[PDB]
Amino acid sequence: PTINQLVRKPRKSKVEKSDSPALNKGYNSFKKTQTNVNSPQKRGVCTRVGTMTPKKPNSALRKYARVRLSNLIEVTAYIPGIGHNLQEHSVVLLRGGRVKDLPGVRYHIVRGALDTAGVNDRKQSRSKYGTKRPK
Amino acid sequence: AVKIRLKRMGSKKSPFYRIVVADSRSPRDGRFIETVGTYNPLKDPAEVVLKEDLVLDWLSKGAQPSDTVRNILSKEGVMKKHHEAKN
Amino acid sequence: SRYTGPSWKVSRRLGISLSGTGKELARRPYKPGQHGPNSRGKVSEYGMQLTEKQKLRHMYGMNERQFRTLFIKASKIKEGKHGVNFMVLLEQRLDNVVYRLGLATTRRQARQLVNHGHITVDGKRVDIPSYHVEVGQVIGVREKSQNISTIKEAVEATVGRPAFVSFDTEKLEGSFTRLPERDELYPEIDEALVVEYYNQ
Amino acid sequence: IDPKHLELEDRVVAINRVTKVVKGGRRLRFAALVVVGDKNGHVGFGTGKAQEVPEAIRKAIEDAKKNLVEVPMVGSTIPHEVIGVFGGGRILMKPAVEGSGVAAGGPVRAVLELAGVADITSKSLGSNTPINVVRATVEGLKQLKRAEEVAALRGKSVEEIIG
Amino acid sequence: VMTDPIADFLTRIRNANMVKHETLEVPASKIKRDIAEILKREGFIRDVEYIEDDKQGVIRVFLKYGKNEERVITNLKRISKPGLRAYVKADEVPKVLNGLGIAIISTSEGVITDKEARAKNIGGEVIAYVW
Amino acid sequence: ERNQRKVYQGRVVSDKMDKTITVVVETKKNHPIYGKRMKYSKKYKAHDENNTAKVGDIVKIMETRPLSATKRFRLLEVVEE
RNA sequence: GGAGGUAUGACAA
RNA sequence: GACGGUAUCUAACCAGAAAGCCACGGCUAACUACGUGCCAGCAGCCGCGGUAAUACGUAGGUGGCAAGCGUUGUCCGGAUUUAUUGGGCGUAAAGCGAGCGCAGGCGGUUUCUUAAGUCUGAUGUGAAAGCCCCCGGCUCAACCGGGGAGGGUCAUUGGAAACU
RNA sequence: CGCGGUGCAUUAGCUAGUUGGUGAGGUAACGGCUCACCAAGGCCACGAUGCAUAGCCGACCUGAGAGGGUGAUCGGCCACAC
Ligand SMILES: [K+]
Ligand SMILES: [K+]
Ligand SMILES: [Mg+2]
Ligand SMILES: [Mg+2]
Ligand SMILES: [Mg+2]
Ligand SMILES: [Mg+2]
Ligand SMILES: [Mg+2]
Ligand SMILES: [Mg+2]
């Protein structure tokens, strides 16, 4: 471009965006608007717990939960690990991160936080999946 | 009132002070016009640094120190010189 | 944090005698573990860099952040060579001073003497093994602690000391007499690899 | 231009396993790029191919010895900034200060360490193909100059030029 | 048209240099005369001569080669394009190739080199580098 | 001797107003990023004492107290009709 | 010698 | 003298009361055994798992950090991936289907003139704290303090005017 | 008062005490600050008006720099007190 062009219209950068828009918003019941807040984790209520079939190179029953967030955005997350204490209406805590198998799951569920029971008999990579030491 | 006082610096339980020219309306640490020395008693005696010319100029222009600063300026001989210059 | 673990294990991973003795490599000069003696495969340049860095911090029992900050403070210097100044600043640590003066058999022993407070600098107690030491100071065993038999054994079992030091046995005081030198340090290390490592 | 009477030592940039295809499947060969030098100014590179890693290495070394070039130096630094282009690989190299060491992560680091340039600031702008980045590197080091040469061309003296 | 005769002059030099021609002819102006004289007395050119014709003074150049083959000039480059003009201070004076080339500057004193400018502690408009 | 209040030189563009005019300065700042020497046609309102100045005429103006809401400047000269 | 025009094939590997 | 019989110093005693987190297919430093058998599960990207898994889970072992470690979320960089520094438009993304022309952008040679741009001397200010340099005190360090340096498409005045 | 610092033109027209003047009043003080009277001017593609967003700054994080992002703690100016 010519410098005249670059003054008549400047370089307008490639607009960016997040891999987790649901975490980057909030809600005040008074004015009832999306409040933009950069929150690492959130709370939600599992509105469904089920299984899904992953993409073609893989084959499995991937455990998901559809969840109703504090900010009233409904979100599909993954239940990592082996086993869960979850049901519909079960309070849950959510963190970010894709699950490359299904597309519609941009989020993960956290273990050891709330009604989510810690994983059972997991001794390695233990902070992850949230289960206390075997003494 | 325009005043010549001392403002607090340094960590807790290890204080230090800067003599300073401050209005009484400003905070303990805030607006100031000029610094004219500094102070700490953390030595076995007290220990002092001063700027005689500027502090005497503000005293002439109408300053009004606090009690401890008056003691310090007495030990450094500035109040006596101001008195003499008024005589 | 401090390392309470084995010495020989570290030394024989790295493939070098840190104590300058040999029995931390003698009879088993291969990395630990049941994949130790068998045919190690190729290794990478990142591996070599990391190994050089780990040699030094395992010598001096140091932490990564201390290491990094000391590297930065050496970088702030312009009057010499970068990694050589880094090694010198490592040498100016009481852990190593006590060792080079022959006042203790190991850097762990030396650190323990320093921290337990059996040592003085210019006649003042110091429980800080990371204490920097400028050329000209006077390290000295605590005049009450000169009676321990451990240090007397360690001092009368002293081989010929380095060139950059001065020391007396009756006084149990010594000091640096130089920057100190580079080549008088362990030439087994390639400081350029640390430089490339932390240039990243 | 002669590798004779020199202590050329080598270093392998990369081995790219590279395939030809036949009715009977795939004919897998190894292609290697090697850079060799004496750490005095004289450096070269070579391409080798073979069904074996060491054979391709040998061939590349023997081709690199036959394609040497000499880089100037100024206290383990190059004289002036330069941009080298060779078909997708742009590299700019700047004269750096002493003690700053090298600023590259291979293959350029290998090329310059073997040529003897201990202190330099470089950057790969374009592609990442080792072959063409190395070729742009040598092209830039060929663009480089010597003060004596330039002053003998211009007629002016060395001090009369640098000022 | 000729919206930049200085750069036309520089590029004509570059083209003749690439084909290894021996001489040039250009519709000249006083700034071209200054630049040609600077190159003459700095070593990038063998010789330069003038021609006075009614429309405009032509200036002819006689280029320089270390041999039949080797070139003294490698490449030139204008910086004040003029779409973005490059004015610089006595500290921001460029140093073409750490002193192995030359920058051509116009200042209150006149058309001079980076040498003279960075010595006198002046600056001005930069109009050409020469590798 | 006392200070000297700011003065500008400019050009007239409208004289349809009594005891006052509009004046244009035409500096040239360099665009902050891309550096190009741009135009910048700042303009002002000047108090004319006598409705002397004519359109498209060069002029000088010195600041002063607000003589109106827009006005901040005082005519000094008339230079080129 | 060369140029311009004149029916279906499971998924993954 | 609230802190406070706290800091601090002395002496007696016990190795005794005081180390875990993540990762180990490649990018990336770090490897085997057993179970499981496209299931369970892993996964930052490439991708692992279908009866011999260094990629799941456990055990052993090792590596990186260490009273912290790992993970998410946010900002920068790498990203020259909005290119002033510092990119491109024949085929990859892109030359409007083509022209007439207001405004603006740019503009042949040259004398004289100005001095808006430009260059430049001096003066002032750019608070302190902070970054940086030299010092010094806290058992060193963080930190704290002193002194200095720098910072403005900054302003007034005074010159040149080669170039616009 | 000069200058400067954010996005949209899928926002192109905006203003009427608004613009200026002669008086008078009014404020610590200048002046449409206010009233009458006279005139119809004034702002804008160098982005007015409108919409959204936001306290600004010293400074902080990053970066080769150019720049980007932020404006917590400390200090300064501003604004607010259901
Ligand atoms: K495993
Ligand atoms: K606000
Ligand atoms: Mg590996
Ligand atoms: Mg895992
Ligand atoms: Mg198995
Ligand atoms: Mg296309
Ligand atoms: Mg300051
Ligand atoms: Mg960058």
TrEMBL record, chain A:
Keyword check for tRNA-binding: yes
Keyword RNA-binding: yes
Any single Gene Ontology cellular-component annotation: small ribosomal subunit
Keyword tags: Ribonucleoprotein, Ribosomal protein, RNA-binding, rRNA-binding, tRNA-binding
GO terms under biological process: translation
Source organism, top-level taxon: Bacteria
NCBIfam families reported for this sequence: rpsL_bact (TIGR00981)
PANTHER family, per database record: 30S RIBOSOMAL PROTEIN S12 FAMILY MEMBER (PTHR11652)
Family: Belongs to the universal ribosomal protein uS12 family.
Role summary: With S4 and S5 plays an important role in translational accuracy.
Subunit and partners: Part of the 30S ribosomal subunit. Contacts proteins S8 and S17. May interact with IF1 in the 30S initiation complex.
UniProt name for this protein: Small ribosomal subunit protein uS12
UniProtKB/TrEMBL annotation, chain C:
Small ribosomal subunit protein uS4 N-terminal domain residues: 2-91
Pfam families tied to this protein: Ribosomal_S4, S4
Molecular function in Gene Ontology: rRNA binding; structural constituent of ribosome
GO biological process: ribosomal small subunit biogenesis; translation
GO cellular component: small ribosomal subunit
InterPro entries: Ribosomal_uS4, Ribosomal_uS4_bac-type, Ribosomal_uS4_CS, Ribosomal_uS4_N, S4_RNA-bd, S4_RNA-bd_sf
UniProtKB keywords: Ribonucleoprotein, Ribosomal protein, RNA-binding, rRNA-binding
Region entry Disordered, spans: 21-44
Superkingdom of origin: Bacteria
Domain RNA-binding S4, first and last residues per copy: 92-156
Subunit structure: Part of the 30S ribosomal subunit. Contacts protein S5. The interaction surface between S4 and S5 is involved in control of translational fidelity.
UniProt family annotation: Belongs to the universal ribosomal protein uS4 family.
Function description: With S5 and S12 plays an important role in translational accuracy. One of the primary rRNA binding proteins, it binds directly to 16S rRNA where it nucleates assembly of the body of the 30S subunit.
Name of this protein: Small ribosomal subunit protein uS4
UniProt organism field: Enterococcus faecalis (Streptococcus faecalis)
Top-level taxonomy: Bacteria, Bacillati, Bacillota, Bacilli, Lactobacillales
Automatic annotation (TrEMBL), chain D:
Sequence ranges assigned to domain S5 DRBM in this UniProt record: 8-71
Record GO biological process: ribosome biogenesis; translation
Annotated TM spans: none
Classification via Gene3D superfamilies: 3.30.160.20, 3.30.230.10
Entries under InterPro entries matching the protein: Ribosomal_Su5_D2-typ_SF (IPR020568), Ribosomal_uS5 (IPR000851), Ribosomal_uS5_bac-type (IPR005712), Ribosomal_uS5_C (IPR005324), Ribosomal_uS5_N (IPR013810), Ribosomal_uS5_N_CS (IPR018192), Ribsml_uS5_D2-typ_fold_subgr (IPR014721)
Cellular component GO terms, alphabetical: cytoplasm; small ribosomal subunit
Pfam family name, one: Ribosomal_S5
Keywords: Ribonucleoprotein, Ribosomal protein, RNA-binding, rRNA-binding
Molecular function terms, GO-annotated: rRNA binding; structural constituent of ribosome
Superkingdom, natural source: Bacteria
Function, as annotated: Located at the back of the 30S subunit body where it stabilizes the conformation of the head with respect to the body.
PANTHER family per UniProt: MITOCHONDRIAL RIBOSOMAL PROTEIN S5 (PTHR48277)
Membership in a protein family: Belongs to the universal ribosomal protein uS5 family.
Quaternary structure note: Part of the 30S ribosomal subunit. Contacts proteins S4 and S8.
Domain remarks: The N-terminal domain interacts with the head of the 30S subunit; the C-terminal domain interacts with the body and contacts protein S4. The interaction surface between S4 and S5 is involved in control of translational fidelity.
Listed name of the protein: Small ribosomal subunit protein uS5
Organism expressing this protein natively: Enterococcus faecalis
Gene name of the record: rpsE
TrEMBL record, chain F:
Family: Belongs to the universal ribosomal protein uS17 family.
UniProt function note: One of the primary rRNA binding proteins, it binds specifically to the 5'-end of 16S ribosomal RNA.
GO BP term, example: translation
Lineage of producing organism: Bacteria, Bacillati, Bacillota, Bacilli, Lactobacillales
Keyword Protein transport: no
PANTHER family: 40S RIBOSOMAL PROTEIN S11 FAMILY MEMBER, SMALL RIBOSOMAL SUBUNIT PROTEIN US17M
Assembly mode: Part of the 30S ribosomal subunit.
CDD domains registered for this protein in UniProt: Ribosomal_uS17
CC per GO annotation: cytosolic small ribosomal subunit
Protein name: Small ribosomal subunit protein uS17
